Subunit: 205 residues, 4 copies
Amino acid sequence: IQFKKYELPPLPYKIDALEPYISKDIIDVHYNGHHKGYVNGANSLLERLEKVVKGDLQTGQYDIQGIIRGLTFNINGHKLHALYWENMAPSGKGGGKPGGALADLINKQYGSFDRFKQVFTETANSLPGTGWAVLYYDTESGNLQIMTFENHFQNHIAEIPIILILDEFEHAYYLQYKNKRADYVNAWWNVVNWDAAEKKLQKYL
Amino acid sequence: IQFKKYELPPLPYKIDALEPYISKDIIDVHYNGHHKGYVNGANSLLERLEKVVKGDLQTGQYDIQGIIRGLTFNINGHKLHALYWENMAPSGKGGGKPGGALADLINKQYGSFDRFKQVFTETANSLPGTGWAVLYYDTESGNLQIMTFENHFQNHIAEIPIILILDEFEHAYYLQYKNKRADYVNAWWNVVNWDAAEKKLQKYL
Amino acid sequence: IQFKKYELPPLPYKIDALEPYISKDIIDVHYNGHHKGYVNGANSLLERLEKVVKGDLQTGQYDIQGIIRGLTFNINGHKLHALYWENMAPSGKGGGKPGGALADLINKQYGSFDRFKQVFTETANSLPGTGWAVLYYDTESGNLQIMTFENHFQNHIAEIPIILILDEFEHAYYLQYKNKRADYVNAWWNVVNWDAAEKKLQKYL
Amino acid sequence: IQFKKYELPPLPYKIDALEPYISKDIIDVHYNGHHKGYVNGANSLLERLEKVVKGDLQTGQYDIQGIIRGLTFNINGHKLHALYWENMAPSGKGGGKPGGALADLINKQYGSFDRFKQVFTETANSLPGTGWAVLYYDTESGNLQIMTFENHFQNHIAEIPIILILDEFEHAYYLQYKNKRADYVNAWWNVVNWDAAEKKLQKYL
Ligand SMILES: [Fe+3]
Ligand SMILES: [Fe+3]
Ligand SMILES: [Fe+3]
Ligand SMILES: [Fe+3]
């Protein structure tokens, strides 16, 4: 008996492809340091949980909440970064405006891409601390629901798909923007992969 | 422009169908009071968010984090309870052991249903405070991942489906079990809807 | 080497002294079940932590975050309930209006006890889930700062003293008020121990 | 009616006094950017809360949880950084080993400063995400309680004094140590102000 381990996905572009909006220095450590660290951390804990399940670790030799809470931290750390890389593209291919159905829903619910952009930016800058800003597609209501996550595992909405995701941990921008998080959020719009977001939305109609 | 509102789903059985494991007194207020309250609370906040989007509420007339955090609380409050009702069934129809593919995966990852049951129960009783105990089916790894949520919105794992869900807020058992949460968890196994769980799993293979 | 253990403080009155606002049925289990449970849970974890410190538990035989997070949960569970009991008194001795310096500060910062009462009640009813509503006395600014805690350990403000504290976990009122939390908050004002609150404030000037 | 505002305390040394353990580049933005930002953010929200109290903001023109949760974030952001600066000192004056009563309690509870150092370091490196590592002096039990905070406001223990505090947000070390948080924690011991910690402990006996 065992659990299947997670694998680090390949970066969809060169570490310097997002310049000048996100320097290669950040991407390098962000992918090779942080993201790889969550794949390793998750697998390491799955291994430890396997021991609890098999009985190799007896009662009193582990503290279940430490393992379980550590898994949601690392597993989300991995899954969220995987979505992040795919949600961005080299400028010229990335940025601009959305089209297809995504553009349509945005117009019906926010009035226009420009208004949506303002509301999302405002919401992302209000996040108290480290976390993420995401745009969900609620398969139940059909709403494009904005949400801010605290850390990697707080504030999620169950089961629904993530269409847009912005990493707001300080490591995602500090080396280049320092404490100017807002400038980072502003620069981010220039590398958003609207094509990828459109394709993901299509899967859920 | 507007957001679509949420609707209270009908209870799949009589309020006394889960007796003697969960009294009708609890089910009545749990469904008609708590769950209905989250549908209303979510819709009320969507309405307020619409005003922010349209501009009927000017800057300084709202505090975005209060609205956004309130939405994850109420929306999850609604979605999680909807899953909860469907995850249980009258004794005789509910409880017992799982079959099909779900039984298979449990045997491969936990060794047996009996061991799985022990680990899930142990994990559910370790939750510090109010929350939920769930069994996920990670579409990425194929793992049946156990997890405890704190409140309705903390500790989730992004996008993956929930196969088993146990409400661990005090209102789910207090009237009948008082502070004996563990007795409630034990009684719960007798009403689990394994058929429904099996069907949901099939959707993701 | 060892850590000193916590002790369950005696209830300052009979379990039925708060009736008809809080029934003896609630007080009994709240004190003898819940509060006692946190003293025991804290002491149990301190002993486990002692083993980690002494080396009786080797690396790989414990998960530090499970122990540390479990301690903040149980220790606050204990400390907060101890403050709660002392912050109430039988109707006649309790309830009414505050006097002395506490009354003074309330008038200067909120305009009147009436207005303060409205703002505190509004804030307490807004808490998303289980937690506490407290009134701090910030020794740095001199402000009587209102705050809502989530669970027993989230949202605290470092080092400053708690003057007023209201338990908002469902177990504090469910048996008598069911899901009508707001009715519980309103009834609570009739048993507040303003004299005790006044004495605590005096200690910090 | 009004609330008193917070003031940015002066840094107890030159921005380059902690080198080579913490570069002046970090201290500069950490104090002039981040800490100043929390004093401003707190004061800004107190003024908004004043408007709610006075009635200048009517119901429907604010979302109380956004204000209250924003205050615990900013107020702790301020208070915790104030403690942080005072808890360090230039190499020579800082670092080394503790003496007086603090040294005594450490020996009685951890066996030795060396062992204490290992346990604190291990605990600090286990923090899942951004936060703080602190050493409390519980006035109730007399225990020197270790604790990790998540963000600036989660996991605190009510009312007790903080003796040691280590900032573990990425901004406290990223520019110099990048993702090597552990190297930062090790370097930190060389600038700890044991004299200041000893004096604070004395106040509580
Ligand atoms: Fe990141
Ligand atoms: Fe519930
Ligand atoms: Fe309580
Ligand atoms: Fe900091």
